[PDB]
């Protein structure tokens, strides 16, 4: 066949099956045959919360939905579906801005996040995506005190013909990353992806470590890191929201990757993250393949979520 909108949406809809049970098309059974009254909005709120949309974001959706329904004096609950699609779409549109890594030498992505939420996999998928676009990639193994994490990137780089800058276990992360930027410049690398420590220290130590790295990058390039990317796991519920808060306060994020959307029946995390922080969501993980780490587009996501 050929690539088509229909084929793409068929797959995207399927990947969100579990989440669509409660959100988007999931709303249809909830509204069917009901009138609009306080009980209805309460049932909707409960459904939103159970899907991990989060109390504050749920409250905002319900308030805005109520106002919209009042402007039209809707009476039938079924008609709320369209307004909800619009309201939840508005939340996501504010953080729709795909990552553009072009035109730098190198474009530096500082990858932050806890270990175990898909950060290491996201590094591999992004590196391959950039190569598939015709860009050269290098990695920096900046999680220097975890031999396992360093060896993981080193072996992967070796097998995939991608250079990986790494030093002995216990090396200074800032120095590994400094050396990596230098190596990347010397080798005309388009994108450098730098891993960082995800075995959470205490907050002060996390802040110190990350600020140290950024400062050291700026000893070479005032624009590095061009992107500070958090990776969080959508199936972890409010853990992902709290993790975003922690890292955003520690270093200041510029982009978010949200993994494992296909793995949970409570897909509200994306709305909570969007609403709470207003940081662009660069990519969403909706499957195991490289291409399944999809650049995030709000309208397409909403269409898939709400399509019955």
Q: Under a CB-based contact definition with an 8 Å cutoff, are residues 105 and 135 in contact? A: no
- Do residue 11 and residue 160 come from a single domain? no
**191 annotated to bind ligand:** no
Experimental method: X-ray
**262 annotated to bind ligand:** yes
**137 annotated to bind ligand:** no
**260 annotated to bind ligand:** yes
Angle at 108 between CA 102 and CA 111, to 5 degrees: 120
**95 annotated to bind ligand:** no
Q: Under a CB-based contact definition with an 8 Å cutoff, are residues 219 and 178 in contact? A: yes
**60 annotated to bind ligand:** no
Beta-bridge partner residues of 164: 139
End-to-end CA distance of the chain: 24
- Do residue 2 and residue 110 come from a single domain? no
**CA–CA separation, 47 and 26 (whole Å):** 9
Domain boundary among 49, 77, 97: 97
CA atoms within 13 A on the CB side of 134: 2
Q: Which two tokens stand for residue 206?
A: 């996390």
- Do residue 130 and residue 273 come from a single domain? yes
- Do residue 177 and residue 306 come from a single domain? yes
Q: At what angle do helices 238-250 and 203-217 cross, to 10 degrees?
A: 50
**57 annotated to bind ligand:** no
- Do residue 155 and residue 30 come from a single domain? no
Residue 103: phi, psi to the nearest 5?
80, 15
**96 annotated to bind ligand:** no
Structure letter (DSSP) for residue 306: H
**CA–CA separation, 96 and 77 (whole Å):** 29
**119 annotated to bind ligand:** yes
- Do residue 41 and residue 102 come from a single domain? no
**143 annotated to bind ligand:** no
**CA–CA separation, 195 and 154 (whole Å):** 12
Q: Which two tokens stand for residue 72?
A: 């039209």
Q: Under a CB-based contact definition with an 8 Å cutoff, are residues 272 and 54 in contact? A: yes
Sheet holding 164-165, edge to edge: 164-165, 137-141, 191-195, 107-112, 227-233, 255-259, 281-285, 293-295
Domain boundary among 97, 117, 147: 97
Structurally, the chain folds into a number of domains equal to 2
CATH number of the domain that 13 lies in?
Answer: 1.20.120.140
CA atoms within 13 A on the CB side of 225: 27
Query: Do β-strands 293-295 and 281-285 pair in parallel, antiparallel, or remain unpaired?
Result: antiparallel
Alpha carbon of 94 to those of 14, 69, 98, 135, 298: distances in Å?
A: 25, 22, 12, 28, 9
**CA–CA separation, 106 and 125 (whole Å):** 18
Resolution of the PDB structure in angstroms? 1.6
Q: Which two tokens stand for residue 229?
A: 């990317």
Q: What is the residue whose two structure tokens read 């979520």?
A: 305
- Do residue 76 and residue 125 come from a single domain? no
- Do residue 55 and residue 135 come from a single domain? no
**Could you list the residue range(s) of the whole structural domain that residue 55 is in?**
1-97
Domain boundary among 62, 97, 132: 97
**179 annotated to bind ligand:** no
Neighbours of 11 (CB within 10 A): 15
Residue 31: phi, psi to the nearest 5?
-90, -20
**13 annotated to bind ligand:** no
**285 annotated to bind ligand:** no
Beta-bridge partner residues of 289: none
- Do residue 72 and residue 84 come from a single domain? yes
**117 annotated to bind ligand:** yes
**CA–CA separation, 213 and 298 (whole Å):** 32
CA atoms within 13 A on the CB side of 119: 30
Alpha carbon of 79 to those of 46, 50, 87, 130, 299: distances in Å?
A: 19, 22, 13, 43, 20
Q: Which two tokens stand for residue 43?
A: 């049932």
**294 annotated to bind ligand:** no
Alpha carbon of 239 to those of 59, 224, 273: distances in Å?
A: 20, 28, 11
* CA dihedral of 163, 161, 98, 290, whole degrees rounded to 10: -140
Q: What would you measure as the largest C-alpha separation in the chain, in angstroms?
A: 67
């Amino acid at each position: 066949e050929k690539p088509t909108k229909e084929g793409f949406f068929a797959r995207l809809k399927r990947s969100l099956l579990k989440t669509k049970e409660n959100l988007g098309s999931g709303f249809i059974s909830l509204f069917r045959g009901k009138k609009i009254d306080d009980d209805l909005f309460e049932e909707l709120e409960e459904q939103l919360l159970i899907a991990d949309v989060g109390v504050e974001t749920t409250r905002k959706i319900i308030t805005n939905l109520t106002e919209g329904a009042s402007r039209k004096q809707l009476r039938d609950a079924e008609a709320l579906y369209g307004l909800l699609k619009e309201e939840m779409g508005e939340i996501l549109a504010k953080v729709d801005e795909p990552l553009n890594v072009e035109g730098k030498a190198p474009f530096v992505i500082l990858m932050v996040g806890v270990n175990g939420v898909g950060k290491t996999t996201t590094i591999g998928k992004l590196a391959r995506q950039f190569e598939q676009q015709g860009k050269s990639v290098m990695l920096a193994a900046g999680d220097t005190f975890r031999a396992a994490a360093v060896e993981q990137l080193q072996v992967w780089g070796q097998r995939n013909n991608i250079p990986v800058i790494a030093q002995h276990t216990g090396a200074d992360s800032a120095s590994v990353i400094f050396d990596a930027i230098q190596a990347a410049k010397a080798r005309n690398i388009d994108v450098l992806i730098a891993d960082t420590a995800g075995r959470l220290q205490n907050k002060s130590h996390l802040m110190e470590e990350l600020k140290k790295i950024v400062r050291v990058m700026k000893k070479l390039d005032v624009e590095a890191p061009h992107e500070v990317m958090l990776t969080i796991d959508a199936s972890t519920g409010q853990n992902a929201v709290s993790q975003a808060k922690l890292f955003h306060e520690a270093v200041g994020l510029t982009g978010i990757t949200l993994t494992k959307l296909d793995g949970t029946a409570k897909g509200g995390v994306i709305f909570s993250v969007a609403d709470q922080f207003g940081i662009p969501i660069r990519y969403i993980g909706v499957g195991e393949r490289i291409e399944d780490l999809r650049p995030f587009k709000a309208d397409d996501f909403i269409e898939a979520l709400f399509a019955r």
